[PDB]
Structures are given as structure tokens and as C-alpha cells.
Write an enzyme that holds these catalytic residues in place. Sequence first.
Site, PDB file in Angstrom:
ATOM      1  N   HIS A  82       3.972  -8.360  -7.888  1.00 30.07           N
ATOM      2  CA  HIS A  82       2.732  -8.030  -7.158  1.00 30.07           C
ATOM      3  C   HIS A  82       2.254  -9.261  -6.359  1.00 30.07           C
ATOM      4  CE1 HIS A  82       1.512  -4.216  -9.485  1.00 30.07           C
ATOM      5  NE2 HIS A  82       2.825  -4.363  -9.460  1.00 30.07           N
ATOM      6  N   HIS A 107       7.825  -3.774  -8.397  1.00 30.12           N
ATOM      7  CA  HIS A 107       7.066  -2.954  -7.487  1.00 30.12           C
ATOM      8  C   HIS A 107       6.437  -1.739  -8.142  1.00 30.12           C
ATOM      9  CE1 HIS A 107       5.998  -0.657  -3.978  1.00 30.12           C
ATOM     10  NE2 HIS A 107       6.756   0.346  -4.379  1.00 30.12           N
ATOM     11  N   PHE A 141      -0.091   0.641  -2.071  1.00 26.25           N
ATOM     12  CA  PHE A 141      -0.744   1.509  -3.056  1.00 26.25           C
ATOM     13  C   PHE A 141       0.002   2.820  -3.229  1.00 26.25           C
ATOM     14  CE2 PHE A 141      -4.828  -0.154  -0.883  1.00 26.25           C
ATOM     15  CZ  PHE A 141      -4.580  -1.414  -1.369  1.00 26.25           C
ATOM     16  N   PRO A 142       1.226   2.770  -3.779  1.00 23.73           N
ATOM     17  CA  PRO A 142       1.999   4.000  -3.827  1.00 23.73           C
ATOM     18  C   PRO A 142       1.344   5.219  -4.498  1.00 23.73           C
ATOM     19  CG  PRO A 142       3.433   2.138  -4.280  1.00 23.73           C
ATOM     20  CD  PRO A 142       2.024   1.589  -4.128  1.00 23.73           C
ATOM     21  N   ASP A 179      15.244  -7.717   0.052  1.00 19.44           N
ATOM     22  CA  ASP A 179      15.732  -8.089   1.360  1.00 19.44           C
ATOM     23  C   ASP A 179      14.545  -8.322   2.322  1.00 19.44           C
ATOM     24  OD1 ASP A 179      14.868  -5.536   2.346  1.00 19.44           O
ATOM     25  OD2 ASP A 179      16.846  -4.693   1.991  1.00 19.44           O
TER      26      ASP A 179
HETATM   27  C1  LIG Z   1      -7.587  -3.883  -2.635  1.00 18.64           C
HETATM   28  C2  LIG Z   1      -7.770  -2.465  -3.043  1.00 18.64           C
HETATM   29  C3  LIG Z   1      -7.091  -1.962  -4.131  1.00 18.64           C
HETATM   30  N1  LIG Z   1      -7.230  -0.722  -4.486  1.00 18.64           N
HETATM   31  C4  LIG Z   1      -6.491  -0.228  -5.650  1.00 18.64           C
HETATM   32  C5  LIG Z   1      -5.157   0.372  -5.214  1.00 18.64           C
HETATM   33  C6  LIG Z   1      -4.112  -0.588  -5.767  1.00 18.64           C
HETATM   34  O1  LIG Z   1      -2.965   0.073  -6.114  1.00 18.64           O
HETATM   35  C7  LIG Z   1      -4.877  -1.239  -6.922  1.00 18.64           C
HETATM   36  C8  LIG Z   1      -4.458  -2.674  -7.174  1.00 18.64           C
HETATM   37  O2  LIG Z   1      -4.513  -3.477  -6.050  1.00 18.64           O
HETATM   38  P1  LIG Z   1      -4.583  -5.020  -6.094  1.00 18.64           P
HETATM   39  O3  LIG Z   1      -4.223  -5.381  -4.797  1.00 18.64           O
HETATM   40  O4  LIG Z   1      -5.906  -5.409  -6.551  1.00 18.64           O
HETATM   41  O5  LIG Z   1      -3.671  -5.430  -7.264  1.00 18.64           O
HETATM   42  P2  LIG Z   1      -2.099  -5.455  -7.336  1.00 18.64           P
HETATM   43  O6  LIG Z   1      -1.603  -4.092  -7.581  1.00 18.64           O
HETATM   44  O7  LIG Z   1      -1.867  -6.552  -8.218  1.00 18.64           O
HETATM   45  O8  LIG Z   1      -1.673  -5.805  -5.851  1.00 18.64           O
HETATM   46  C9  LIG Z   1      -0.942  -6.926  -5.410  1.00 18.64           C
HETATM   47  O9  LIG Z   1       0.422  -6.617  -5.239  1.00 18.64           O
HETATM   48  C10 LIG Z   1       0.619  -5.464  -4.460  1.00 18.64           C
HETATM   49  C11 LIG Z   1       1.987  -4.884  -4.635  1.00 18.64           C
HETATM   50  C12 LIG Z   1       0.324  -5.914  -3.051  1.00 18.64           C
HETATM   51  N2  LIG Z   1       0.513  -4.840  -2.153  1.00 18.64           N
HETATM   52  C13 LIG Z   1      -1.142  -6.343  -3.037  1.00 18.64           C
HETATM   53  O10 LIG Z   1      -1.435  -6.858  -1.755  1.00 18.64           O
HETATM   54  C14 LIG Z   1      -1.452  -7.392  -4.071  1.00 18.64           C
HETATM   55  O11 LIG Z   1      -2.824  -7.751  -4.106  1.00 18.64           O
HETATM   56  O12 LIG Z   1      -6.233  -1.219  -6.585  1.00 18.64           O
HETATM   57  C15 LIG Z   1      -8.045   0.064  -3.805  1.00 18.64           C
HETATM   58  O13 LIG Z   1      -8.177   1.295  -4.190  1.00 18.64           O
HETATM   59  N3  LIG Z   1      -8.716  -0.347  -2.720  1.00 18.64           N
HETATM   60  C16 LIG Z   1      -8.596  -1.615  -2.336  1.00 18.64           C
HETATM   61  O14 LIG Z   1      -9.268  -2.063  -1.314  1.00 18.64           O
HETATM   62  N1  LIG Z   2      10.737  -9.830   2.204  1.00 16.04           N
HETATM   63  C1  LIG Z   2      10.126  -9.099   1.228  1.00 16.04           C
HETATM   64  N2  LIG Z   2       8.950  -9.565   0.761  1.00 16.04           N
HETATM   65  C2  LIG Z   2       8.284  -8.897  -0.209  1.00 16.04           C
HETATM   66  C3  LIG Z   2       8.814  -7.736  -0.761  1.00 16.04           C
HETATM   67  C4  LIG Z   2      10.040  -7.265  -0.288  1.00 16.04           C
HETATM   68  O1  LIG Z   2      10.619  -6.142  -0.811  1.00 16.04           O
HETATM   69  N3  LIG Z   2      10.671  -7.961   0.696  1.00 16.04           N
HETATM   70  N4  LIG Z   2       8.118  -7.122  -1.765  1.00 16.04           N
HETATM   71  C5  LIG Z   2       6.704  -7.411  -2.052  1.00 16.04           C
HETATM   72  C6  LIG Z   2       5.829  -6.560  -1.124  1.00 16.04           C
HETATM   73  N5  LIG Z   2       4.419  -6.936  -1.180  1.00 16.04           N
HETATM   74  C7  LIG Z   2       3.710  -6.875  -0.033  1.00 16.04           C
HETATM   75  C8  LIG Z   2       4.053  -6.032   1.018  1.00 16.04           C
HETATM   76  C9  LIG Z   2       3.343  -6.097   2.212  1.00 16.04           C
HETATM   77  C10 LIG Z   2       2.306  -7.005   2.421  1.00 16.04           C
HETATM   78  C11 LIG Z   2       1.493  -7.108   3.699  1.00 16.04           C
HETATM   79  O2  LIG Z   2       0.590  -7.922   3.641  1.00 16.04           O
HETATM   80  N6  LIG Z   2       1.669  -6.417   4.837  1.00 16.04           N
HETATM   81  C12 LIG Z   2       0.792  -6.644   6.013  1.00 16.04           C
HETATM   82  C13 LIG Z   2       1.412  -7.501   7.143  1.00 16.04           C
HETATM   83  C14 LIG Z   2       2.861  -7.979   6.996  1.00 16.04           C
HETATM   84  C15 LIG Z   2       3.758  -7.838   8.222  1.00 16.04           C
HETATM   85  O3  LIG Z   2       4.160  -6.721   8.629  1.00 16.04           O
HETATM   86  O4  LIG Z   2       4.159  -8.865   8.810  1.00 16.04           O
HETATM   87  C16 LIG Z   2       0.225  -5.385   6.639  1.00 16.04           C
HETATM   88  O5  LIG Z   2       0.448  -4.256   6.138  1.00 16.04           O
HETATM   89  O6  LIG Z   2      -0.491  -5.506   7.663  1.00 16.04           O
HETATM   90  C17 LIG Z   2       1.994  -7.868   1.377  1.00 16.04           C
HETATM   91  C18 LIG Z   2       2.692  -7.809   0.171  1.00 16.04           C
HETATM   92  C19 LIG Z   2       6.428  -8.898  -1.874  1.00 16.04           C
HETATM   93  N7  LIG Z   2       7.124  -9.419  -0.692  1.00 16.04           N
END
Ligand SMILES: Cc1cn([C@H]2C[C@H](O)[C@@H](COP(=O)(O)OP(=O)(O)O[C@H]3O[C@H](C)[C@@H](N)[C@H](O)[C@H]3O)O2)c(=O)[nH]c1=O
Ligand SMILES: Nc1nc2c(c(=O)[nH]1)N[C@H](CNc1ccc(C(=O)N[C@@H](CCC(=O)O)C(=O)O)cc1)CN2
Lengths: 241, 241
Positions: free
Chosen positions: A75, A94, A105-106, A125
Amino acid sequence: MKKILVISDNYQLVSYIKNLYLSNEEWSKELFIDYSYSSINRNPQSLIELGMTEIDIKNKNLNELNDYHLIISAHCKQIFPAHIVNNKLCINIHPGLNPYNRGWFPQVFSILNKKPIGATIHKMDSEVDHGEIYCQEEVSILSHETSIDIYNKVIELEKKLIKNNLLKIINNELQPKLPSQEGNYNSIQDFNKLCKLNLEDNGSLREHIDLLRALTHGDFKNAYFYDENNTKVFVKIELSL
Amino acid sequence: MKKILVISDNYQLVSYIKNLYLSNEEWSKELFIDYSYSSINRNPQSLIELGMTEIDIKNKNLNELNDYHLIISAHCKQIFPAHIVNNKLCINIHPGLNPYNRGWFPQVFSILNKKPIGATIHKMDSEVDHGEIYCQEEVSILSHETSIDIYNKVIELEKKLIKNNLLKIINNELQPKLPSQEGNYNSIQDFNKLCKLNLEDNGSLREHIDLLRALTHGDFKNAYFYDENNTKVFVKIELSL
Ligand SMILES: Cc1cn([C@H]2C[C@H](O)[C@@H](COP(=O)(O)OP(=O)(O)O[C@H]3O[C@H](C)[C@@H](N)[C@H](O)[C@H]3O)O2)c(=O)[nH]c1=O
Ligand SMILES: Nc1nc2c(c(=O)[nH]1)N[C@H](CNc1ccc(C(=O)N[C@@H](CCC(=O)O)C(=O)O)cc1)CN2
Ligand SMILES: Cc1cn([C@H]2C[C@H](O)[C@@H](COP(=O)(O)OP(=O)(O)O[C@H]3O[C@H](C)[C@@H](N)[C@H](O)[C@H]3O)O2)c(=O)[nH]c1=O
Ligand SMILES: Nc1nc2c(c(=O)[nH]1)N[C@H](CNc1ccc(C(=O)N[C@@H](CCC(=O)O)C(=O)O)cc1)CN2
Ligand SMILES: [Cl-]
């Protein structure tokens, strides 16, 4: 011994990894593990409390990563650049069932579009949530459940995957395989479109409850409408047996 | 002096009336007030704690009520028989704006049907929430409000109407007026139909959010659906600035 780098911005998964190391002698006799959170984490206190260090993986010189047998993203809030993932073994934990609803947020998307949800450990990758899969498992979505409910199942599943598979991956004991297909990807903009409610939308009550529950997650401020005076109103739902 | 009987199943209103008596010389010098809750009240403990006595106004013999100048109903759970209202001056404190949404839970229905909401003090006739109106005042309904939000405003306005008018009514200084129309009565069965959600219902998001906020009122279990396995799931909404 091996050196391992864990980059995580999730308290629960890093704590869990730390605890496995302190309770499993195979881990502690074989591994050195550094742990870092991302430089863009806006609230890293709880992680700093565990002695973790900051890292900016987009600006980290390849040169300073030579010791690491591999890198784990649990994460992580940053996309690893191409140059990192193509020159170091990088493995991601993931919270989705690749290749379905990859990206943001799958479980929010799966509640709405009914594709499988789950947890996946996979090679990284240059693409997001795309590389070969080591293990994964599905979890179910029940009628009463919101985002936070399913998310919590996924975290528990991630812990299971780590417990049963992470050391084998590190020891090159587990061999990954291509995702069955390209899949689908959801961006932050997609999440934001969903949050901007349209009070005129015509649909089933089912469809509208599902939207509200996908968007219900603890204190996050997600779904909103604007009322006739342009006051912003956030909306969440509670479902109970 | 004048003997007054208050039949109430609402802790707030009865407590308020007792507080006005205790605080206003015009009350203690002119009135003896007896207080009862209804025999059908399933949880009267908080009212018993005020030393209130049980009354069954549907079985009460009229000769036993001769001493009373008038009887006040304040959220009484029983319909007074014709014999009682036609032979004793009986006044009701009603948490709706008569003649709109007379009967059960006025503010639920007003959230749904947009008829005015408010509070009313009226003479009781043999019909429900139907006699001549001494005084009444509207409250408004805001986009972010649930049943309990509007109900709270009603109760506050009920206090203001009591404080400003109840002694005048008792001393025949305020003459009531016919309601503007027959109006509409909602029954308990009507409320229960609204609670039985239809997941196939087609409507605007507005419509569905309104139905769910009309049915959200603290810990009461109101709106429900049945899922695929016939599990009953209750639904509440939260709206927030
Ligand atoms: C930030 C945010 C989060 N959420 C919910 C949906 C998420 O699945 C859940 C957890 O989000 P989180 O970002 O606090 O915690 P994590 O699930 O630890 O997320 C972290 O690793 C993810 C794979 C990355 N995509 C995130 O950017 C990163 O912060 O909370 C919301 O419902 N609304 C939001 O604005
Ligand atoms: N290499 C690569 N890096 C990764 C993963 C991967 O499997 N491949 N897996 C994880 C994925 N976690 C994420 C995915 C997306 C963002 C993200 O912040 N996206 C931005 C901008 C990024 C961009 O497109 O340049 C957006 O949606 O605007 C942050 C953490 C961590 N990093
Ligand atoms: C019982 C019940 C109540 N409610 C809500 C809506 C109501 O306006 C509110 C309070 O109702 P209440 O019955 O607890 O309290 P009161 O508003 O004091 O109501 C009393 O006087 C009324 C004139 C009578 N119609 C009621 O039977 C009687 O109980 O709570 C619900 O949402 N669901 C419920 O099942
Ligand atoms: N006389 C008379 N009695 C009253 C009032 C009135 O202004 N006139 N005002 C208050 C109204 N309170 C109520 C109203 C309805 C019920 C009730 O129990 N209703 C049932 C029965 C309906 C019916 O038989 O009409 C139902 O909804 O199915 C109970 C307390 C107190 N009693
Ligand atoms: Cl008329």
C-alpha cells in the site's frame, strides 16, 4: 542473509510484517528488513512511531538500492518509476483481485460493477497493478456491506497471503504467472465522478443504495450533493442486520 | 383555583410543563395539575420517575373527571373516545402543522410530501388532530435534515407555544379557529408501508435520499429491504455539512 526493503504507507500491514519477523525465527535468522513510508504521505505519524524512515522512490538513486534482494510495496502511495521496477525485483501487496478493478480503491468499484474483489501479491512492472501474480484470493460482498466493510476483509486477506506466501516469494520458492487478461483500471478521477452526486439521476433504489454504500468509508468525506442554495452536503449510508 | 389533568407520554413536554409551573407564580397560585401517562405506553419508566400515574382514558369513567377544568393531551398515545372530548374540554399539543399530515409522525410525511410542518395546539374533537386550532407555527425543512432533526425543531416550538399560550387557553383568553381544510391523516400502517423499501423502485436520487432521510430517526429501526437470501437489512442515511 538478505536485505529487504519494505515501502508501506499502511500501519496494519507493516505492523503485521514486523510482528511476523519478531515471532518467526526463519525470518529473523535470514533477513535484515528496513521499512520506509513515502515522502508524499501527509499523515505519517503512526509509521514514524514505529521508527520507519521516509523514502521518495521516484527520486531514489538506483545505486543506493544495490544491497536489497528485493523491494516490497505494501500500500505504497507512489508509482515506482520504470527504472526501479525494471532493475530491482519489486513486489506489491494489492487490495484488489487483479486484473479486475486495478488502480484506485478496488472494493468501491466492485460494489458497483460486480467484478471480483480480493487481495493479490504480484510482481511490479512499469504499469499499475499489472505484473505477474504470485498468489491471490477472492472475498465476498454481502448486501449490507460498505466500502470499509469489504476493505477490512481485504486487509485480513492480505495478512493471510503475507503469512503463507511472503517468505516463499523472498526465498524464490514461489513462481508467478501472467494475469489472464489486461483487466480494467479505475482512476482517482473516476472515484471523484462517482462522489459528485446527481440528484436528478434516474435509477432503481437498489442502484442508489449501492452507490451510497460503495462511497461509505468511515469518516472519509466522499459523496456529496449541492442543494438549491449551493450548500455542499455529504451523504453516507448505514446498513444493519 | 382550577384542577388540570395532563395526559402525556412524552418526557420532554411533561417535564417542561412541570418546569413552568415551578417557575411561574401565575401557575402555582391558580392551578392544581395532575399528571398521567397512558396505560398502553410500553416504556413509561422515565415518566414513572416523575411520580406520574397510569391512566387509561378509553376506559376512564367520565364521572371520575368532574373536577377538571380541562384535560391536556401532550403526545398521548391513545385516541380519546367521543364521550370524553364531547363532555370535557380537551386540548392537544400536536407535533405537526394541522391540518397537514395529521396523525402519525408528521415530519416523516412532510419530508416526503412537502406539506407544511410545525406544531399546533388545538381543541380535541372525536377525530384525530382535527379540532379548532388555538395557535400553531411552522418550522422549515433543510436539505441536510432527517426526521429527528425536524422533530427536534417541532418539540422546541411546542415548548414555545406552551410557554406563550397554554395559560391563556386555560383561562379562556385565546379562542380557537377552524382548520383551513379537512387535511390528510397518516396512519401507522402508512408509515409501515414506507418502511418496506422497494429496491426496484424507479426514482430520482433526490427522491430516494428524501425517502431515506424521512425514515432516519436515531436508533429506531425503520426502513428495510430484503436481500437475495431474504436477509432483512435496515437502512439509514447520514447527511452532513
Ligand atoms: C483517501 C480515501 C480513502 N477512502 C477509502 C477507500 C480506500 O480503499 C480506503 C483506504 O485508503 P487509504 O488510502 O487511506 O489507505 P490504503 O488502503 O493504505 O492506501 C494506500 O495504498 C493504496 C493501494 C494506494 N492507492 C493509496 O494511495 C495509499 O494511501 O479508504 C475513501 O473512501 N475516500 C478517500 O478519500
Ligand atoms: N510501477 C509500479 N508502481 C506501483 C505499483 C505497480 O504495480 N507498479 N503498485 C502500487 C500502486 N499504488 C499506487 C498506484 C497509483 C498511484 C497514483 O498516485 N496515481 C496518480 C498519478 C500517477 C501517474 O499516472 O503518473 C493518479 O491517479 O493521478 C499511487 C499508488 C505501488 N506502485
Ligand atoms: C415509534 C417510532 C418513532 N419514530 C420517530 C418518529 C416520531 O416522530 C418520533 C417520536 O415518536 P414517539 O412515539 O417516540 O414519541 P412522541 O412523538 O412523543 O409520540 C407520542 O405522541 C404521538 C402524538 C403519538 N402519535 C405516538 O404514538 C406517541 O408515542 O420518533 C420512528 O422513526 N420510528 C418509530 O417506530
Ligand atoms: N379524540 C382525539 N384523541 C386524540 C387526539 C385528537 O385530536 N382527538 N389527539 C392525539 C392523537 N394521538 C393519537 C392518534 C392516533 C393514535 C392511533 O392509535 N392511531 C391508530 C388508529 C387510527 C384510528 O382508529 O383512527 C392508527 O394509526 O392506525 C394514537 C394516538 C391524542 N388523542
Ligand atoms: Cl375543506
